[PDB]
Amino acid sequence: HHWGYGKHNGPEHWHKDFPIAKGERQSPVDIDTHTAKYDPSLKPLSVSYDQATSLRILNNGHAFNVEFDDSQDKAVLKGGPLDGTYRLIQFHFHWGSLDGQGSEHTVDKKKYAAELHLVHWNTKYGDFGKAVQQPDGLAVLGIFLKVGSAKPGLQKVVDVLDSIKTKGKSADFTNFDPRGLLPESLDYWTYPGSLTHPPLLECVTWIVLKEPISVSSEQVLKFRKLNFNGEGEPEELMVDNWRPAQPLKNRQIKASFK
Numbered sequence: 023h024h025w026g027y028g029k030h031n032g033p034e035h036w037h038k039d040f041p042i043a044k045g046e047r048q049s050p051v052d053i054d055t056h057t058a059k060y061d062p063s064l065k066p067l068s069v070s071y072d073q074a075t076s077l078r079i080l081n082n083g084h085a086f087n088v089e090f091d092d093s094q095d096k097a098v099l100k101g102g103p104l105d106g107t108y109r110l111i112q113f114h115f116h117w118g119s120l121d122g123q124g125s126e127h128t129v130d131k132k133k134y135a136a137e138l139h140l141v142h143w144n145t146k147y148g149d150f151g152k153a154v155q156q157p158d159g160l161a162v163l164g165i166f167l168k169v170g171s172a173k174p175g176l177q178k179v180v181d182v183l184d185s186i187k188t189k190g191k192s193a194d195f196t197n198f199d200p201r202g203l204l205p206e207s208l209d210y211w212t213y214p215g216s217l218t219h220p221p222l223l224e225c226v227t228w229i230v231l232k233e234p235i236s237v238s239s240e241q242v243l244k245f246r247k248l249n250f251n252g253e254g255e256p257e258e259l260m261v262d263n264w265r266p267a268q269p270l271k272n273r274q275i276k277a278s279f280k
């Protein structure tokens with residue numbers, strides 16, 4: 023029927039409706055740290071989130087998205103492997119039913135408790151919808167979440183989750199600063215990939231940060247209380263909304279460090 027993360031509509035079934043699922047540049051992948059090539063030509067990342075304008079938080083049925091105003095160069099990503107400016111449109115997470123799983127990318131087969139994705143689109147294309155028709159249309163910054171100490175900057179998000187429990191619900195969510203979700207270091211791995219959920223479009227340049235952020239058990243716990251289902255429907259907890267690692271194929275992962 024329509025795609026999800028269950029037994030009957032899960033990742034293994036996506037290819038039926040979205041044949042690119044078996045494409046040549048699918049994401050996520052396992053990052054093999056000993057086979058990743060250090061590239062000294064890689065420039066440092068430039069994250070300018072000082073002028074970020076968050077607007078709303080939404081449960082879309084597969085995750086919760088925090089949305090930002092992208093009508094101007096307010097919160098952008100540039101540098102690293104990118105050419106041009108990329109504006110932040112939204113961020114969301116992928117998590118598991120247990121602490122031992124939840125991330126999409128893996129590092130030497132290690133899975134984290136969750137993974138944050140800050141989605142950006144290439145301003146040369148004018149809008150999001152056109153950027154997804156290009157091979158260099160999007161840039162996604164991926165950050166790993168491990169369970170440990172609480173992340174202060176994540177608390178405002180955790181707290182509004184009750185008001186967007188079910189699919190389709192949304193809440194006003196202004197003045198949220200995403201600078202609070204970045205680790206100390208900006209060292210990364212980069213490779214050409216795709217969106218990790220349908221439509222699985224191969225428009226992404228992935229930037230995966232080496233350093234994870236810590237969140238408390240209680241913070242991850244509140245994520246696990248969301249619902250995939252709409253209000254008034256039988257309850258299905260939003261957990262395991264992650265896609266397994268795909269074959270690297272004809273690709274090379276580059277490292278900005280050694």
Ligand code: MMC
Nearest residue numbers: 156157224225
């Ligand atoms: C090609 Hg997107």
Ligand SMILES: [Zn+2]
Nearest residue numbers: 114116139218
């Ligand atoms: Zn994602």
